[PDB]
């Protein structure tokens, strides 16, 4: 709340509006925390916010899954076992046991 208020006098006083470090001096605190405070303060945007074209295209339709695993990798995972399991039968029974162990 204090921040909105400060931007007010300084809004017309500075003629455009105070710089990110301006209200920082106006405020008691470390003043770089302004940035940190400013992030969490934003309210989340409706994932249903209709974007462009109005075509029921909605913001949420554009949010990709980053936790997924592309198959071109999962495929190489199924392979990497077959790779390493083979090279470990190519070694002595104890080296495979010792390496599978370490």
């Amino acid at each position: 709340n204090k921040l909105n208020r400060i931007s007010r006098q300084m809004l017309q006083e500075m003629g455009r509006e105070p710089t990110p470090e301006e209200l920082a001096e106006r405020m008691l605190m470390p003043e770089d925390k302004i940035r940190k405070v400013l992030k969490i303060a934003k309210e989340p945007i409706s994932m249903e916010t209709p974007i462009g074209d109005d075509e029921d295209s909605h913001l949420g339709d554009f949010i990709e899954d980053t936790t997924l695993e592309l198959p071109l990798d999962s495929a190489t995972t199924e392979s990497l076992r077959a790779a390493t399991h083979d090279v470990l039968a190519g070694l002595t029974a104890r080296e495979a046991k010792v390496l599978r162990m370490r």
Binding site: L11, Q12, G15, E64, L68, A75
Partner: protein, 1340 residues
């Protein structure tokens, strides 16, 4: 004839002389905004007008008033170029002087103290470019002019369909400029209704009560009075001898001692004549006729003081007695006629629940706000605020004007609100139409269609800003302390600033300027839209408004409109059209007095033109300009017919004025079907500029006007001689007549160099003049993209042959010789902006460092120490533009990966590779790099180098200005010193700086030398301040978004040529997609051996009736003929005589054209340069409807030495044998639209996925798969393909398990699917189950 015309002159066919030349094509855009922001010392539209409405603002009754003084626009923060690079909006600060007055308590008014607060800043409003575009964030945007329904009253029909009883209805609608709508409408029972806005229907009379009108005055207003006298006993009556028309006699009717008519004889012209001339005022009547008649006023019994009858009640034979015995002599009744005067208003009162003013006011307030209790102050106040409040209601000037005009009033200007007189007059007029007297207007007429535009529209938004701040301003002045707070602490910026920003930023009328092409620009800035706010919608209307209207003549182009969902909802402005003074559309016309055609032009609006008889653009007059024929084709009122010699009041200005800038550029348009012409002018705007600006060989003559009027070219500010010519800049030394006395000067044009367009095309200027060449003011200095020597070249004309070629042209497909791609002529240059952002994540900040996990030196080759690609490194797909790395710690890898790192001994980094890399397949040369940095983060090495470089280049740039400027100024001092004390050889020896001392003998030359001193020192000082700001602007830390530490924007210039798949079209609506690129060997050649560039399929010609494209071909060939011919006499070096003779012959052509020509031109240097420009071809101008004719075309082909048929024999380059039949070969101007195949082409195997629904979604630009629809499903359902369909909607898209299980099988070599259940449907189960529904999958 001008200087850039001496270089090349276009042979102009056509007869009709141009009386007026095309004005500035950007007039509308520029004039409008110019009226908005300006100091207008009166109520004319502008920031001034919107201020004076809501001002002055007083607190609530507290007698604390705040008034408004004046405003000013501060200097722009960045100029247009600077504003574009950084991303800011091009804007100026609005500084407004405010005066706060306080009345003493309690006072006869006077001020304790008044603080005049100087210019409080509210918002920065964007500014319009010299070309009429806006820059919102580093991006050019155009605001389309709007066409809406004009404010006023309008009476409509809504015939036919209503109630399916026929009968039509008649409704009036008052549409004010601001405030609620007032609607009046009838019903099948002829009861008048009213609804405010679209709200509940209400009986009309309730407003009269709300206007404080009791029933008696309602009866007294709309109806006449039938006076009844009881004289002796039982009922005499007053008679207007005319009232008996259209009705039959009710009793024995006799007066003036002579019985004129008995009972049962209808009243014709006979009966009325007798009464009028015999002056029959009073007759004796029976007591039964009033059984139906409604009493006018109230009549009470004098004795009992009790009400005998209320107003508007039907009398009976018995009722007459009770008011007769009360001593009533007079009983007033209504005049009712079912043809002339309908008993409509009367029947509405019986449906009126109200009685008095408050009742009506309550019933209105409860209509508007139902559910809430009415209040005396609420009902009274609300009604007073709707149409009677200066704040919440305005019709403005036009509303009042059209209002007054449609009501047949005298005053064209009046109150900006409604008066009791105003509403009532409309009601009277609406009834008159229902009575058969008067007619209804129609919405589609362009006299009722008003055109707004940027200046006006932005003004409305600024008003909204002031009202949403108004509520705030009163609120603070309530509690204000005496002289502590001031007219700053109250007024904020953001409320006003966010209003205007919300408009320029995302309103439907503000769009990216479709800028691949000057024609595209100029046709965007002249555009109308009936869409957006205050307009109709695609879904609402309705083919009448979409259709072309008779009033569109000379105002709106009939043929340039989109062919999509909104047809006729956009249009384009005509060529000569202008916005009327009041805001309508008026067009030029020529005043024809008596039988002579005068050259005074007269601009007539849609309604003005109505009454006049207007002649035709094509008509033959001569000598004094008498119409040759005794009768001429003309249009007078909505229709066209033959008109007499002296009838015509006016005549068309030009043969062109019906069309638009787009359509006026199509040659032989008169020969093209309207569909293909539309399509032609629609596609002509998509033509990407080419590598070599060519010129149209076949043309109209607008191309000069389009090039200059669009800012793409560089036009001379003042005339003079070119001092210096570089590919960078141009310095003109002004002629003395054009030069200002002070400062001397030279006008320096800084050319735009290679840079990105909105469509990712290349916009680059080239100098068209040579060292030391005379140029006069208004001469073309430099071509822009797609402009040649002052003309408009949207593509390159080329040799074309019509013939099926082995199916390679099958439908519209085009077969192009390799000569074209080798000549690199249709090659096009694209400039792409790629960005790399270093953000901040909860795990840590992202680094732009050149240290990237798991990459070799070949990657790092193209990178400097800092991680940014060098300028000029040509790059291809996959190359690293900007090294970027994001923190990810403690990966938690797996056993076999852990073994992998152990064996190959790589230290797996705590950092992940985010670097910006070239998209797959796009390849180009890096022409620029930008680094924006947050204020406070240390600029890395490269970023500092750049900033230092930009600084040196800036210093060099400013100094170059000063050096040439100083010489130009000192060069004037030298000449004035020579006028009275010339020492020529003596003067230029000593240092030039030591000149300012020498004075002169008494004369103005002493004050002139005096003058140049003053202006010199300012230059010394203005330069200094200019340098400093520039330096500061570089060093100032650039502002970024929240979370972004730094941004690297890389600019690639890709050069794409032509390949199968590009879309190409001529101006005639013939599309095409290049099919094969053929060797010159297989190209058809003529006997002389010259191959043909393009082979078109003739089959496209007959079906689509674009016939202009053929003439254009034929004539095109002829033009090329004169070139080859000239190319021979010049390669012969015959001499000026032989050459001059032949060129003169060409420009005449057979008789009766309008071109004129030489030999006035200096016979050697001026003539010879022109011939060099014609050897490629001789440019020809076919005016739109005045264009050339076959004979002239055929005649020009005779001079060409080329056949009249326009066809020759052609030989296949393969078999070498002839072609049976002659084939048409010629030169067609052809455009490359930007539908380029390596834009369109997309393919995806396995990409990213949407999270919410697991579905293919492009995140890397490896695009989500093609969208598979319902109709496409049916196609599979009609086929037996079950497995194709299952795999389509399960494993190929939605099955998050099955997809991976599938992929592994594809590489294993097993084509199967283990489908499972789609996640979309699997979600549907939870959504149903998330409600109270138990949905199960039964059985087994």
């Amino acid at each position: 004839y001008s200087y850039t015309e001496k270089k090349r002159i276009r042979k102009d066919f056509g007869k009709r002389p141009q009386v007026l030349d095309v004005p500035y094509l950007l007039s509308i855009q520029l004039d409008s905004f110019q009226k908005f922001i300006e100091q207008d010392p009166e109520g004319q539209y502008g920031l001034e007008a919107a201020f004076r409405s809501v001002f002055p603002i007083q607190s609530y009754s507290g007698n604390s008033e705040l008034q408004y003084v004046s405003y000013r626009l501060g200097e722009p923060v960045f100029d247009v170029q600077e504003c574009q690079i950084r991303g800011v909006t091009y804007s100026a600060p609005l500084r407004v002087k405010l005066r706060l007055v306080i009345y003493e308590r309690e006072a006869p008014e006077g001020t304790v103290k008044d603080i005049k607060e100087q210019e409080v800043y509210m918002g920065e409003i964007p500014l319009m470019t010299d070309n009429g575009t806006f820059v919102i964030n580093g991006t050019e945007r155009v605001i389309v002019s709007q066409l809406h329904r004009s404010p006023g009253v309008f009476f409509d029909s809504d015939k036919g369909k209503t109630h399916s009883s026929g009968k039509v209805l008649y409704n009036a609608r008052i549409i004010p400029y601001r405030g609620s709508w007032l609607d009046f409408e009838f019903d099948p029972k002829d009861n008048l209704f009213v609804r405010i806005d679209r709200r509940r229907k209400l009986p009309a009379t309730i407003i009269l009560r709300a206007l404080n009108y009791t029933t008696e005055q309602i009866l007294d207003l709309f109806f006449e009075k039938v006076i009844f006298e009881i004289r002796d006993n039982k009922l005499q009556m007053e008679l207007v001898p005319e009232r008996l028309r259209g009705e039959t006699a009710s009793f024995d009717i006799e007066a003036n001692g002579k019985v004129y008519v008995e009972k049962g004889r209808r009243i014709t012209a006979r009966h009325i004549r007798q009464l009028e001339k015999d002056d029959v005022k009073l007759i004796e009547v029976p007591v039964e006729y009033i059984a139906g008649k409604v009493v006018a006023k109230d009549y009470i019994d004098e004795s009992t003081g009790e009400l005998i009858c209320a107003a508007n009640m039907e009398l009976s034979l018995d009722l007459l007695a009770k008011l007769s015995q009360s001593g009533h002599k007079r009983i007033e009744t209504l005049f009712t006629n079912d043809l002339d005067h309908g008993p409509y208003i009367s029947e509405t009162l019986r449906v009126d629940p109200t009685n008095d003013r408050l009742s009506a006011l309550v019933e209105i307030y409860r209509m508007m706000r139902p559910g809430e209790p009415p209040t005396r102050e609420a009902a009274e106040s609300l009604f007073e605020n709707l149409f009677f409040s200066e704040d919440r209601y305005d019709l403005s000037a036009v509303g009042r004007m059209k209002f007054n005009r449609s009501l047949l009033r005298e005053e064209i200007e009046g109150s900006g609100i409604l008066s009791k007189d105003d509403i009532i007059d409309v009601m009277k007029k609406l009834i008159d139409i229902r009575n058969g007297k008067g007619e209804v207007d129609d919405i589609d007429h362009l006299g009722n269609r008003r055109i707004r535009s940027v200046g006006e529209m932005a003004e409305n938004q600024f008003r909204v800003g002031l009202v949403r701040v108004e509520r705030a301003v009163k609120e603070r002045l309530s509690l204000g302390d005496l002289d502590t707070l001031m007219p700053q602490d109250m007024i904020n910026a953001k409320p006003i600033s966010a209003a205007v920003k919300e408009f320029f930023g995302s309103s439907q009328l503000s769009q990216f300027m479709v800028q691949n092409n000057p024609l595209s620009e100029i046709t965007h800035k002249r555009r109308i839209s009936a869409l957006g706010p205050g307009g109709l919608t695609r879904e609402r209307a309705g083919f009448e408004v979409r259709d072309v209207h008779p009033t569109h003549y000379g105002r709106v182009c009939p043929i340039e409109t989109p062919e999509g969902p909104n047809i006729g909802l956009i249009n384009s402005l005509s060529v000569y059209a202008q916005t009327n003074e009041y805001g309508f559309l008026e067009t030029p016309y020529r005043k024809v007095t008596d039988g002579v055609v005068t050259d005074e032009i007269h601009y007539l609006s849609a309604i003005e033109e109505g009454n006049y008889v207007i002649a035709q653009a094509n008509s033959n007059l001569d000598e004094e300009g008498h119409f040759v024929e005794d009768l001429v084709t003309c249009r007078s009122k909505g229709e066209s017919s033959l008109f007499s010699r002296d009838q015509v009041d006016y005549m068309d200005v030009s043969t062109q004025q019906v069309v638009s800038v787009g359509a006026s550029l199509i040659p032989f348009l008169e020969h093209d079907d309207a569909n293909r012409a539309l399509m032609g002018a629609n596609m002509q705007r998509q033509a990407v500029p080419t590598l070599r600006a060519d010129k149209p060989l076949v043309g109209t003559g607008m191309e000069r006007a389009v090039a200059v009027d669009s800012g793409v070219t560089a036009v001379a500010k003042r005339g003079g001689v070119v001092q210096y010519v570089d590919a960078s800049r141009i310095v003109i030394k002004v002629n003395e007549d054009e030069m200002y006395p002070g400062e001397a000067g030279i006008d320096i044009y800084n050319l735009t160099k290679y840079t990105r367009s909105n469509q990712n095309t290349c916009i680059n200027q080239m100098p068209c003049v040579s060292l030391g060449e005379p140029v006069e003011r208004g001469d073309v200095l430099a071509d822009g993209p797609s402009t040649d020597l002052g003309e408009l070249a949207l593509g390159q004309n080329m040799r074309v042959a019509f013939m099926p070629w082995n199916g390679y042209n099958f439908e519209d497909s085009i077969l192009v010789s390799e000569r074209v791609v080798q000549e690199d002529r249709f090659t096009t240059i694209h400039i792409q902006e790629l960005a790399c952002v270093s953000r901040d994540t909860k795990l840590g900040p992202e680094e732009i460092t050149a240290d990237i996990p798991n990459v070799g030196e070949a990657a790092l080759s193209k990178l400097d120490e800092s991680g940014i690609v060098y300028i000029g490194a040509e790059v291809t797909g996959g190359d690293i533009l900007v090294g970027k790395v994001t923190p990810k710690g403690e990966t938690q890898l797996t056993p076999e990966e852990k073994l992998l790192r152990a064996i190959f001994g790589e230290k797996a980094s705590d950092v992940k590779d985010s670097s910006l890399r070239v998209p797959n397949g796009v390849s180009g040369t890096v022409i620029d790099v930008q680094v924006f940095t947050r204020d406070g983060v240390e600029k890395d090495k490269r970023a500092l180098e750049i900033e230092e470089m930009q600084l040196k280049q800036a210093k060099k740039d400013l100094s170059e200005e000063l050096q040439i400027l100083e010489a130009g100024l000192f060069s004037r001092i030298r000449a004035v010193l020579v006028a009275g004390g010339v020492e020529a050889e003596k003067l230029d020896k000593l240092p030039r700086d030591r000149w300012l001392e020498l004075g002169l003998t008494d004369e103005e030359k002493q004050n002139q030398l005096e003058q140049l001193a003053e202006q010199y020192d300012e230059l010394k000082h203005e330069f200094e301040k200019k340098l400093e700001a520039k330096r500061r602007k570089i060093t100032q830390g650039d502002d970024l978004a929240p979370g972004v530490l730094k941004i690297v924007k890389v600019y690639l210039a890709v050069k794409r040529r032509i390949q199968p798949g590009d879309k190409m079209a001529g101006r005639h609506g013939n599309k095409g997609v290049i099919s094969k690129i053929n060797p010159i060997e297989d190209m058809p050649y003529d006997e002389n051996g010259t191959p043909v560039d393009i082979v078109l399929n003739p089959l496209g010609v007959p079906s689509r009736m674009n016939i202009g494209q053929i003439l254009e071909t034929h004539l095109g060939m002829a033009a090329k003929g004169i070139g080859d011919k000239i190319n021979a006499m010049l390669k012969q070096q015959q001499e000026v005589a032989k050459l001059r003779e032949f060129i003169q012959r060409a420009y005449d052509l057979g008789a009766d054209v309008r071109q004129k020509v030489d030999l006035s031109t200096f016979s050697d240097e001026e003539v010879m340069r022109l011939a060099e420009n014609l050897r490629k071809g001789m440019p020809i101008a076919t005016p739109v409807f005045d264009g050339a004719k076959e004979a002239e075309i055929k005649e020009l082909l005779k001079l060409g030495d080329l056949p009249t048929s326009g066809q020759i024999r052609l030989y296949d380059g393969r078999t070498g044998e002839q072609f049976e039949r002659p084939v048409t070969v010629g030169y067609m101007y052809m455009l490359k639209l930007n539908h380029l195949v390596d834009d369109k082409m997309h393919a995806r195997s396995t990409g990213s996925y949407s999270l919410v629904t697991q579905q293919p979604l492009g995140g890397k630009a490896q695009f989500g798969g093609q969208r598979f629809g319902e109709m496409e499903v049916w196609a599979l359902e009609a086929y037996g393909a079950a497995y194709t369909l299952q795999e389509m909607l399960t494993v190929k898209s939605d099955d998050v398990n099955g997809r991976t299980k599938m992929y592994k099988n594809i590489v294993d070599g097993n084509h199967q699917m283990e489908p499972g259940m789609p996640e979309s449907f699997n979600v549907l189960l939870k959504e149903i189950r998330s409600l109270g529904i138990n949905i199960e999958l039964e059985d087994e």
